[PDB]
């Protein structure tokens with residue numbers, strides 16, 4: 001069949017959870033994409049904490065981050081996410097979406113180099129207008145689910161214009177789930193500063209013989225629904241028999 | 245701050261499964277080890293498919309293996325393990341203990357360089373006597389649970405005398421389980437050619453703030469019990485509160 005194909009049956013998974021949004025899949029072997037909503041699939045939003053993927057890559061490649069063991073000391077300002085009020089390395093910072101650590105990265109990266117790198121990566125609208133340390137939260141950067149997949153595919157194949165090492169370390173840091181059936185490398189996000197408020201989940205499922213890339217976003221009025229990002233993606237993956 | 249400590253309560257986990265063997269833990273933070281049996285902990289056996297860890301490292305470092313995507317074509321000889329009668333890369337070869345792929349690696353590595361490398365790694369008794377392509381199954385190499393942990397600790401810290409790249413690729417290939425509580429990187433083994441028949445499981449549990457290295461072996465008269473390697477290790481890890 002075609003390059004892209006709408007499967008509106010996935011909408012039953014959003015309906016079940018009184019939710020709206022898109023899941024995009026890309027079967028790497030067949031070079032075919034699938035989504036419940038071709039229009040929303042190409043709607044650009046603030047990347048929010050999904051920006052931690054390219055931010056990590058740029059920080060590692062410029063030596064702002066030496067490796068996944070280097071400790072970034074809590075600045076001692078109590079914030080409302082308990083897990084942020086502690087020291088972190090790249091693995092825990094990505095795992096717990098520790099914004100303050102990445103703001104520090106962004107400040108040392110600086111706007112000139114952040115800009116070159118987002119152009120080299122062909123990342124979303126490639127726009128860093130706003131604060132060099134908050135533009136992925138309330139500045140000019142925008143990216144669609146299908147633009148996330150394009151970026152992730154370059155990362156998986158070690159094709160981005162950064163070292164092989166930087167790509168391996170970030171792919172390591174993205175580790176989220178693994179068993180005898182599959183591996184998930186992914187990153188969550190919650191955009192709240194500009195409407196509409198959305199939750200992100202972008203990454204890929206490794207199997208023995210194939211890779212399935214995915215990017216989903218959904219309306220997130222309150223944080224009560226953040227667990228639906230993974231739950232709804234996993235309902236789609238199961239319906240398509242990509243995971244048991 | 246005693247270096248090694250016998251905890252005989254773990255024996256109840258082998259007893260419940262009508263089994264005998266050892267689990268060795270090493271808390272990296274505290275530099276303290278724990279085992280159910282100090283004597284068996286230091287008893288050397290054939291590494292069997294646990295040899296795939298150093299074998300992988302040596303193959304990658306010498307360019308016998310270019311990367312984790314390179315395909316090793318089935319030689320077309322039907323063997324007793326279904327999953328071996330198919331093409332493999334490093335990830336699937338490690339996952340399915342595909343002996344024939346690693347025999348091919350060993351033949352290209354050659355005994356001179358295999359020997360230098362095991363000495364550089366301080367790997368068990370450092371003895372490759374027997375067939376260059378079967379010595380880890382029925383030749384002279386022997387290694388204890390505590391010698392496994394020594395080796396694995398060098399791998400984790402990227403300290404072996406091979407490239408950082410080789411160590412990262414193998415640590416990637418070792419991925420076995422991951423969730424939001426822990427990550428397990430490990431390799432299984434079943435020694436059957438020389439008595440006594442034993443099952444191995446060696447690797448480590450990554451947490452947010454610590455690493456717990458582990459090596460267990462157990463009597464494996466038949467293959468019916470191979471699943472006890474992980475089940476018994478996990479009962480110990482749970483008892484010690486290393487995993488929920």
Ligand SMILES: *C(=O)[C@H]([C@@H](C)O)[C@H]1C[C@@H](SCC/N=C/N)C(C(=O)O)=N1
Nearest residue numbers: 048049050081097137188189190191
């Ligand atoms: C990134 O998009 C977010 C930033 C803009 O605040 C952070 C916030 C977390 S939501 C976790 C809420 N639960 C608290 N324990 C997040 C994410 O989910 O990706 N990234």
Ligand SMILES: [Br-]
Nearest residue numbers: 171172415416
């Ligand atoms: Br990895």
Ligand SMILES: [Br-]
Nearest residue numbers: 165408409412
């Ligand atoms: Br590297």
